[PDB]
Amino acid sequence: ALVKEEIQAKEYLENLNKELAKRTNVETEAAWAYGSNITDENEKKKNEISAELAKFMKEVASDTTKFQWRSYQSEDLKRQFKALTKLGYAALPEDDYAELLDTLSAMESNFAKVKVCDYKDSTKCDLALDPEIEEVISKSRDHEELAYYWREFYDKAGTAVRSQFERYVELNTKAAKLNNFTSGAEAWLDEYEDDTFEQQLEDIFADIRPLYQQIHGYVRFRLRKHYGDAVVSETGPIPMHLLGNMWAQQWSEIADIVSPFPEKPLVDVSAEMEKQGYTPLKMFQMGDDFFTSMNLTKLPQDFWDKSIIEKPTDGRDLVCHASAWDFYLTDDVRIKQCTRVTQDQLFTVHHELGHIQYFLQYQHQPFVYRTGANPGFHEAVGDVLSLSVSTPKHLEKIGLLKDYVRDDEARINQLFLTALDKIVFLPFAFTMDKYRWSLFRGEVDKANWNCAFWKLRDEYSGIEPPVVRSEKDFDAPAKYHISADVEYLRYLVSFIIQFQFYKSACIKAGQYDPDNVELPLDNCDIYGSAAAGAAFHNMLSMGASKPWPDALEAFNGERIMSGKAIAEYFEPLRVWLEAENIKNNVHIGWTTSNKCVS
Numbered sequence: 001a002l003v004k005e006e007i008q009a010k011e012y013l014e015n016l017n018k019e020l021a022k023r024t025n026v027e028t029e030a031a032w033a034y035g036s037n038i039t040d041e042n043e044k045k046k047n048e049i050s051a052e053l054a055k056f057m058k059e060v061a062s063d064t065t066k067f068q069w070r071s072y073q074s075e076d077l078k079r080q081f082k083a084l085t086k087l088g089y090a091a092l093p094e095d096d097y098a099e100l101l102d103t104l105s106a107m108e109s110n111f112a113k114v115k116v117c118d119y120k121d122s123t124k125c126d127l128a129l130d131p132e133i134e135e136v137i138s139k140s141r142d143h144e145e146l147a148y149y150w151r152e153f154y155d156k157a158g159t160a161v162r163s164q165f166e167r168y169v170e171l172n173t174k175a176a177k178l179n180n181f182t183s184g185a186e187a188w189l190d191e192y193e194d195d196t197f198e199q200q201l202e203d204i205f206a207d208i209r210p211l212y213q214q215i216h217g218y219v220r221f222r223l224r225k226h227y228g229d230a231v232v233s234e235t236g237p238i239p240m241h242l243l244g245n246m247w248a249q250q251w252s253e254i255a256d257i258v259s260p261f262p263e264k265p266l267v268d269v270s271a272e273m274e275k276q277g278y279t280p281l282k283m284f285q286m287g288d289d290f291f292t293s294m295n296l297t298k299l300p301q302d303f304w305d306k307s308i309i310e311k312p313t314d315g316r317d318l319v320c321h322a323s324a325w326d327f328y329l330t331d332d333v334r335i336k337q338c339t340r341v342t343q344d345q346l347f348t349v350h351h352e353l354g355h356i357q358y359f360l361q362y363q364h365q366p367f368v369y370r371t372g373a374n375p376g377f378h379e380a381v382g383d384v385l386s387l388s389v390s391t392p393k394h395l396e397k398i399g400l401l402k403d404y405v406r407d408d409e410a411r412i413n414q415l416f417l418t419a420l421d422k423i424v425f426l427p428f429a430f431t432m433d434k435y436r437w438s439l440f441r442g443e444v445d446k447a448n449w450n451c452a453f454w455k456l457r458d459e460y461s462g463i464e465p466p467v468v469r470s471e472k473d474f475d476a477p478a479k480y481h482i483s484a485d486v487e488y489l490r491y492l493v494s495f496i497i498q499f500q501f502y503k504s505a506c507i508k509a510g511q512y513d514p515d516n517v518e519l520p521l522d523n524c525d526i527y528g529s530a531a532a533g534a535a536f537h538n539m540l541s542m543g544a545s546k547p548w549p550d551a552l553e554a555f556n557g558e559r560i561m562s563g564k565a566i567a568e569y570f571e572p573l574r575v576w577l578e579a580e581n582i583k584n585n586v587h588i589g590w591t592t593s594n595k596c597v598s
């Protein structure tokens, strides 16, 4: 009978969760060792442990059918059982799973091992993306030099893994169907527990899209004045190599040439960080200080002992792309970041520490609940702090911003600088998964895979490659997350909901009042606010124990994902920019790109 069985089921889950945490610890350790030190030996070890865990998960999923779990009274027990039925890749036959793991490490290691030759020195060929190539992309205003590094990187990080990517799509699809999802798109979207999630994002994106078009138009106008009309046309997509980022996902590196008021201050604290002798250690300690100032959890000793916060100086290959790691015990959490002393890196440190805080907040939960309310929640945490860290208010407090006068023009500069990151990112992030969804769903023929990528980049972001590409190239895997099989929609969700969290935290902190000119949202600093921290504790401690609207409700009483807050933040910019584009007769929109030959 069911009453007795539900009691047995509760005991079953309690033991299984603890077992899963312990088994996952071992897989995570091997994954950490490989990421910190890429070798054929470590790859083999990582993949063999994963195969072992997958086999165990199959048995778990099989064992769930022995319990009448759908018949139970407890919503909590039913939720835990449902989590256990979701095998993902582990649903694949033994041999297929092994092949997928081999395909995945082939792609990630290719990306991590990319090296190009110096533009000026063809004998020096040890330039890696992080930091050598990214430094040129962020700093050079030599458009031909930029185009050279763009092509070299995309050819090596992208085109080189086409065959592996193709097999990955096939096996990803096979896995999704074994879990009875239509494709990997539906498998990813399942994490958001909402059958209208795509439509919701289309609706929010459509509301913010006109502001992006205005920013795009103004930036193109300003780039024409810098590079001339031979490099940048008035009516075409912007050549992406001029935007200060390898993937044109963030344009903040070219703020010095596109800022609304060039004679007024533009916040760039990298030089002052170097002048004050900042180190990666100091940056992480400052991050820790921010969290604890909000009455949140201090970084444990394991973090400091085990984390890698600087790029190793030996000859070894590693994944430098920053990440945060949960080892599923108590207080064993780590970051691996090839940290540099820059303003954007200070934000990246806080982003990564946001993941760590989430790990610590929910580590008391049963294993299946030791993850974000949804993937976007996990990405949002650290960005909420970075928003306040980025304010002139905060940067003055820590002595990184000196002799700053916050007049109307300086405010517009700062709002624009923020938008070059936050608004610009939105169409980018959407296209990363729109692309992969379309491949997963079988909506694009293999003969059209490359130009399908560039078509989306054109349609949504109005950017294009610096040189003509074709189906002989394969450019998508040149973005880390595409080579590394990391879902990207989490970041689109994050960039929307982080403003919901930020607005609410600022109101709680007494730092934002819409009717008070002295408390604007764009200058809110939540440092030292226990009240804002209390909201975070209430939400983060839940992990995935409840559907995400319940986690949002615990933060601020709301249950709906909304673009209201991000629009509210940027409203003063929207008003000024619409007027400025009209003042300057700025062309808005773009013709279809000629840069991908079918």
Ligand SMILES: *[C@@H]1O[C@H](CO)[C@@H](O[C@@H]2O[C@H](CO)[C@@H](O[C@@H]3O[C@H](CO[C@H]4O[C@H](CO)[C@@H](O)[C@H](O)[C@@H]4O)[C@@H](O)[C@H](O[C@H]4O[C@H](CO[C@@H]5O[C@H](CO)[C@@H](O)[C@H](O)[C@@H]5O)[C@@H](O)[C@H](O)[C@@H]4O)[C@@H]3O)[C@H](O)[C@H]2NC(C)=O)[C@H](O)[C@H]1NC(C)=O
Pocket (backbone or CB within 6 Å): 178, 179, 180
């Ligand atoms: C993805 O979707 C798949 C369907 O498209 C699904 O695959 C199905 O899973 C079913 C298991 O839930 C499975 O059903 C069993 O079928 C057995 C016979 O199947 C044969 O013939 C089929 C064609 O006629 C072939 O396709 C098969 O290959 C087989 O040759 C039955 O013998 C079996 O039965 C037993 O189990 C049920 C248990 O059900 C419950 O039992 C409790 C008792 O505790 C009851 O209280 C409760 O009410 C309920 O009845 C018993 O009722 C029964 O007495 C037997 O013990 C069972 O029906 C099905 O075969 C399979 N394939 C297909 C094509 O249907 C995947 O599972 C889905 N994947 C995921 C991850 O969800």
Ligand SMILES: CCC[C@H](N[C@@H](C)C(=O)N1[C@H](C(=O)O)C[C@@H]2CCCC[C@@H]21)C(=O)O
Pocket (backbone or CB within 6 Å): 321, 322, 323, 324, 347, 348, 351, 352, 355, 379, 486, 491
């Ligand atoms: C395995 C990928 C980890 C990922 N790594 C970071 C560096 C990352 O990829 N990104 C995303 C990116 O770099 O594409 C944007 C996101 C916005 C804040 C700064 C860095 C964040 C993460 O921590 O979410």
Ligand SMILES: *[C@@H]1O[C@H](CO)[C@@H](O)[C@H](O)[C@H]1NC(C)=O
Pocket (backbone or CB within 6 Å): 037, 039, 040, 041, 042, 314, 316
């Ligand atoms: C990297 O891994 C190799 C074996 O794969 C090991 O011998 C070596 O100690 C590791 N290097 C470092 C710097 O940890």
Ligand SMILES: *[C@@H]1O[C@H](CO)[C@@H](O)[C@H](O)[C@H]1NC(C)=O
Pocket (backbone or CB within 6 Å): 295, 530, 537
């Ligand atoms: C700090 O957090 C604890 C719970 O973690 C809470 O009880 C306490 O009230 C908080 N401190 C302040 C000053 O609010």
Ligand SMILES: [Zn+2]
Pocket (backbone or CB within 6 Å): 351, 352, 355, 378, 379
């Ligand atoms: Zn993240």
